[PDB]
Design a protein around this nucleic acid. Structure first.
Ligand SMILES: NCCSC[C@H]1O[C@@H](n2cnc3c(N)ncnc32)[C@H](O)[C@@H]1O
Length: 394
DNA sequence: GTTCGTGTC
DNA sequence: GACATCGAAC
């Protein structure tokens, strides 16, 4: 995934279209395997262009035009009919935590250039917006990117943008990059029309085959899910979990790190600051320490008020599943979701926990969100259906 | 307040 | 595969 597998390249080329003599671009091209593959497949009567930032990487055939620039700050003379490629992925931030390292002034420039830039954001998001803006009307884009933009908040504006700028086809590939931890999708964007079509794929020796899954003709940027009749059925059967509960996150690690009550060793009256490694399906391991942090249990409420109260805990970083337990002791947590019943909500804690851990709930989330992200996110959690057995809003 | 991507066994 | 980041980001 500084290299794309040949069958991914070929799959993408099979989705790509350009008029005769039309302008074809590969951003972050290096040696330009997408331009090479498109030319092998469709011939030579096109204008082939490759943008690369690193002169050690730029190595195009003499029939293509190579440009040494930052694709994201680059201002071409003319727009393009087709843009295809594999964007660089990663968060721009401090080298101690994040992979992309640019001067603050450059990231300032990126944030000014991109209307979709939200939160920490990502290089692959910036690349997608850049490319759509360099398309002529009716132009086509074919990119391979992580799947995380289908569901995540950072990419809400990117999704709204794509829905507003034309028509979108999404093909799920999954973990198709050897030795890279990512679930991938192929986007086919065309700068005209509207709506969204979602596709699954089939992988053979002959390569990838698209399987039409679902169509959203009036898509506006809504989260993208693999919906079935079964998932729809379960979703109407109860109240959304978010209507019953206030959903809060744990206090972060540095909040605890600097609190005068928190120690780095166990001792009299001291209790471990819990993490996801303490949370199990239906129970909490209060004994083990995984954070390296101890504090008096009674002092936990100074970090979050709700730490003083027995409440429901749901997992965030165990993949796309629902792992829940009742925290009857009310301990300090460094991780996970913390759910507080809304005014007039009658709950049955053990019966609700039991339902959230159930195999029915596991399939449900795995069907909708697959392996897009290594998390149960707030957006997935709040839409979980809860029938009257487990919680009732009077 | 809380988000996001591998990191390490 | 297991089993989850954890803190700089806003
Ligand atoms: N398309 C192949 C994978 S992405 C890796 C390539 O993207 C290039 N790259 C990363 N950021 C870039 C940018 N902002 N503009 C142009 N090329 C970039 C790298 O130099 C590298 O050759």
């Amino acid at each position: 995934r500084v290299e794309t597998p040949p069958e991914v390249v070929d799959f993408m080329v099979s989705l790509a279209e350009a008029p005769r003599g039309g302008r074809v671009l590969e951003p972050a091209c290096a040696h330009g395997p997408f331009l090479r593959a498109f030319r092998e497949a469709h011939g030579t009567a096109y204008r082939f262009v490759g943008v690369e930032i690193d002169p050690k990487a730029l190595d195009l055939p003499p029939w293509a035009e190579g440009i040494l620039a930052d694709f994201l700050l680059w201002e071409p003379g003319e727009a393009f009919d087709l843009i295809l490629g594999n964007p660089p992925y990663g968060i721009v931030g401090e080298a101690s935590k994040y992979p992309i390292h640019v001067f603050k002034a450059v990231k300032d420039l990126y944030k000014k250039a991109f209307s979709t830039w939200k939160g920490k954001y990502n290089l692959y998001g910036a690349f997608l917006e850049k490319a759509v803006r360099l398309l002529k009307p009716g132009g086509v884009l074919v990119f391979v990117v992580p799947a995380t933009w289908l569901v995540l908040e950072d990419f809400a504006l990117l999704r709204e943008f794509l829905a507003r700028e034309g028509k979108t086809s999404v093909y799920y590939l999954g973990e198709v990059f050897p030795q890279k931890k990512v679930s991938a999708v192929v986007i086919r964007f065309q700068k005209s029309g509207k709506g969204l079509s979602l596709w699954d794929t089939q992988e053979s020796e002959s390569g990838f085959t698209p399987i039409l899954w679902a169509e959203y003709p009036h898509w506006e940027g809504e989260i993208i899910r693999f919906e079935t009749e079964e998932t729809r059925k379960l979703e109407i059967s109860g109240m959304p979990l978010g209507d019953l509960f206030h959903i809060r996150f744990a206090a972060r690690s540095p909040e605890f790190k600097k609190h005068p009550a928190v120690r780095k060793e166990p001792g009299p009256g001291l209790v471990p600051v819990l993490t996801g490694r303490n949370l199990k399906p239906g129970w909490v391991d209060y004994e083990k320490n995984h954070s390296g942090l101890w504090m008096p249990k009674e002092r936990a409420k100074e970090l979050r008020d709700f730490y003083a109260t027995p409440h429901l805990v749901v997992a965030h970083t165990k993949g796309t599943r629902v792992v829940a337990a009742w925290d009857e002791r009310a301990y300090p947590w460094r991780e996970e979701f913390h759910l507080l019943p809304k005014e007039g909500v009658r709950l049955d804690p053990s019966s609700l926990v039991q339902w959230l851990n159930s195999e029915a709930m596991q399939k449900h989330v795995r069907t909708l969100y697959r392996d897009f992200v290594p998390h149960l996110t707030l957006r997935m959690l709040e839409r979980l259906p809860v029938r009257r057995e487990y919680g009732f809003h009077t």
